[PDB]
């Protein structure tokens, strides 16, 4: 019970290195902002795609805020 909630964002465009940063910092930002967990995938060809899984709506909510604003 409880588990864990996931969720992937179809990701295409320079996403990942903008939302990493220099080497990755934004992931904790949300990590800690929104108590879930954000991981952005490396090594790209065709399609991107981000994993995000946490557990409240933080989950959710960053997931779709990603989607939006990918701060």
């Known amino acids: 019970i409880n588990r864990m909630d996931y969720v992937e964002?179809?990701?295409d465009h320079?996403?990942?290195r903008h939302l990493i940063g220099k080497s990755g910092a934004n992931i904790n930002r949300i990590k800690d902002q929104?108590?879930?967990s954000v991981r952005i995938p490396p090594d790209?060809?065709?399609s991107?795609?981000?994993r995000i899984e946490g557990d409240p709506q933080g989950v959710q909510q960053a997931k779709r805020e990603l989607?939006?604003?990918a701060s």
């Open 44 to 46: 790209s060809e065709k």
């Open 48 to 50: 991107n795609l981000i």
């Open 9 to 11: 964002i179809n990701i």
């Open 67 to 69: 989607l939006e604003l």
């Open 34 to 36: 929104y108590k879930v």
């Open 14 to 16: 320079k996403f990942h």
